[PDB]
Amino acid sequence: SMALSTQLIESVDKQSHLEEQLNKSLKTIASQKAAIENYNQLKEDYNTLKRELSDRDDEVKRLREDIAKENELRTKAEEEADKLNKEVEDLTASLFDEANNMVADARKEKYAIEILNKRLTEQLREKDTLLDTLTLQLKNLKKVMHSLD
Amino acid sequence: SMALSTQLIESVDKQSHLEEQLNKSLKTIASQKAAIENYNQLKEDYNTLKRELSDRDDEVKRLREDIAKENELRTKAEEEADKLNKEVEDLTASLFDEANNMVADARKEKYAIEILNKRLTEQLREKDTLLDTLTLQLKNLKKVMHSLD
Amino acid sequence: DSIMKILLIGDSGVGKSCLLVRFVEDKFNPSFITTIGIDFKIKTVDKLQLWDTAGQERFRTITTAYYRGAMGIILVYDVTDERTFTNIKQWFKTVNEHANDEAQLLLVGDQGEALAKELGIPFIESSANVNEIFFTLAKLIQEKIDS
């Protein structure tokens, strides 16, 4: 039938027309190829980069945290280290006072005695002379006796 | 009849397979184009990122340097007090012990003489009486001297 | 009140360390500087806290604590030993960062006179007099509350 026949004839004209245009437009992509190939690469890089940074940032946030603690600690340490470096000046004074005295006291209690000894030692010597004298006073008469009568 | 259709149909499905085929590529040119238009503005937002990122890098470093530094400081101070306390326990424990010893040695030395001041506080009173007898042997041997009237 | 807390450093054994034994008459006062590197005596003149130190001894972290308060300071060395002298140099260095450079310092051991005038500080000798050696410092220590 001449009916479809025409149609087919037409569905072959339009068809052919496409091959024409397509052949051109598809010929344009072939020109942009490399030019685009080297835009995607960039795009790929740019993206990858975008991630490492999206990470380094999370990290930087993380360190600020950590360096903030450490400080709120070095500070307290430095603190006790001093608060407890004041109390020292005193402590040691006592430590040394009590000790010193402690000793001193004992050492005197020896000294006292030490003295009394020296005393008796001579408080003796004295008596001992009188005696080695009287003993002679007698000895001398007990001779005058055995002479006269 | 039931044959020219086949040619007819195909001519269409084929025709379509190109309207589409081409219709696609048609898109892949407008975008690809806009793209090659932002290859310029891109490189910039990329380079403008190849730094902003680097910057972070550097920040991330110094942060460690800093935390570290801070941790050293903490430590020095966290162990400035350890050492002190440790140093006080010693001094204390030594001071007294040596004190305690010094005190003994006297008490010991003191006890010695403590005794001698007895071996004599004795020997003394002893001769005190050995005196009187000799003291008397006089008055008596003095009378036996006043015989010749 | 009026207590001049001094601090001797670099004392040399029971030969010089007895510096306090010398400054103090008390014969009943034990002396730990011998065994223990330090000692703590006190006398009265016109009070005087006197932390005597020989530097080289465990309680260094403490002798240091003494610095943060000393009003006077004598750096000392033994004469019969060129070793002690050598330390002297170091001694003054310690006294710097830790202690106070505003409080009256003093050095006491015709040669030493050299390093003596190299620090802008008085100087004497291992005489053994001594009783007046603290009189000096102290005298200047008071010639400080004039401002």
UniProtKB/Swiss-Prot annotation, chains A, B:
Taxonomy, superkingdom: Eukaryota
Coiled-coil portions: 13-149
Record's subcellular location: Bud neck; Bud tip; Cytoplasmic vesicle, Secretory vesicle
Protein function: Guanine nucleotide exchange factor for SEC4, catalyzing the dissociation of GDP from SEC4 and also potently promoting binding of GTP. Activation of SEC4 by SEC2 is needed for the directed transport of vesicles to sites of exocytosis. Binds the Rab GTPase YPT32, but does not have exchange activity on YPT32.
Quaternary context: Interacts with SEC4. Interacts with YPT32, preferentially in its GTP-bound form.
Domain observations: The N-terminal domain (1-374) is sufficient for the exchange factor activity.
Other known facts: Present with 13200 molecules/cell in log phase SD medium.
Family statement drawn from the similarity comment of this UniProt entry: Belongs to the SEC2 family.
Protein name: Rab guanine nucleotide exchange factor SEC2
Interval of the full protein contained in this chain: 17 to 162 of 759
Swiss-Prot record, chain C:
GO BP: ascospore-type prospore assembly; autophagy; exocytosis; Golgi to plasma membrane transport; membrane addition at site of cytokinesis; protein transport; vesicle fusion
Source organism superkingdom: Eukaryota
Motif (Effector region): 32-40
Membrane topology annotation: Lipid-anchor
Compartment list: Cytoplasmic vesicle, Secretory vesicle membrane; Cell membrane; Cytoplasm
Any one GO molecular-function label of the UniProt entry: GTP binding
Keyword set, alphabetical order: Cell membrane, Cytoplasm, Cytoplasmic vesicle, Exocytosis, GTP-binding, Lipoprotein, Membrane, Nucleotide-binding, Phosphoprotein, Prenylation, Protein transport, Transport
A cellular component annotation (GO) from this entry: mitochondrial outer membrane
Residues given in the record as GTP binding sites: G10, D11, S12, G13, V14, G15, K16, S17, D52, T53, A54, G55, Q56
Similarity-based family: Belongs to the small GTPase superfamily. Rab family.
Name of the protein in question: Ras-related protein SEC4
UniProt lineage: Eukaryota, Fungi, Dikarya, Ascomycota, Saccharomycotina
